[PDB]
Amino acid sequence: VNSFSGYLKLTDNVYIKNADIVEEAKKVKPTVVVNAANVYLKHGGGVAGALNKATNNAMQVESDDYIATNGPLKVGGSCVLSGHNLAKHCLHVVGPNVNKGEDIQLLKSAYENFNQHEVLLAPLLSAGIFGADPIHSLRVCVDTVRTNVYLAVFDKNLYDKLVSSFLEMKSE
Ligand SMILES: Nc1ncnc2c1ncn2[C@H]1C[C@H](O)[C@@H](COP(=O)(O)OP(=O)(O)OC[C@H]2O[C@H](O)[C@H](O)[C@@H]2O)O1
Structure with missing residues (x-):
């Protein structure tokens, strides 16, 4: 279990990979996979629908x-x-x-939930259907989560743009 492979280490505890979160979960057999949910757990599109279909x-x-x-x-x-x-x-x-x-400051509260888990496979919360900037969602992840988070970004162009923007933000 938790056989993560081929990730780019962004911080001592945050890792990122250009991958579909469902295919990763079947490869890795994680203890925790994160779903980007709504409050009624009605899995529409996005990660929720992909996870649910699988x-x-x-x-x-x-x-x-x-x-x-x-x-x-x-x-x-x-x-x-x-x-x-x-x-x-x-x-x-x-x-x-x-x-x-809804209050974007609740994105911090959402990522705080990750801190109850040693290791997790996760998407970028609120960055799709929920309309937040993916660079912001990555920023809040890196700033909020202290546990080991393996991020799956399936779209190569977004992945490249997120890495580029992370480098710029880290170096200031
Ligand atoms: N298979 C995949 N593997 C890896 N990454 C994937 C993916 N599919 C999509 N992404 C990316 C896009 C985006 O960068 C991030 C989150 O996008 P998201 O899934 O739309 O989550 P949100 O929090 O923004 O919206 C929540 C609402 O939509 C939901 O269906 C739920 O029901 C609720 O109503 O993960």
Whole structure:
């Protein structure tokens, strides 16, 4: 388990790879895979839909059960559910949907959830459907997370731009 390979080390605890998070999860067998969720755990597009499809929809049936028992999450919050065939656990984290004007400062609260886990495979929270700048999401990740985070960025052009922007920001 946790057989991460081919990552670029950005900090002593943050690693980044140009890869699809589902294919990584099947390669790596992580203890925790992170899902970029909404508060109802309705897995639409993005990482949530990719993860859910790879579980043959088991993720969504789990999520419906969870919500029926517990109610929706709060923005910036999380819950640990099963990782099904992809990981031991899936950490569902809700970033702010800036497209809806939710507080971007909740992106820090969202990444803080990662600090409850030794090692995790994760996407860049709020950087897709939720409209945050991916460079910002990387910045908050690096500044907030102290545990070992392996970031999967599937789009090569975004990956190249994120690395370039990280170098500029680190050197100042
Ligand atoms: N297969 C893949 N492997 C690796 N990276 C991937 C990927 N697919 C997409 N990305 C990238 C794009 C983007 O850079 C980041 C997060 O994008 P995102 O998944 O849209 O998450 P958000 O927090 O912005 O929106 C949350 C809302 O959409 C969700 O469906 C959920 O239901 C909620 O309603 O990961």
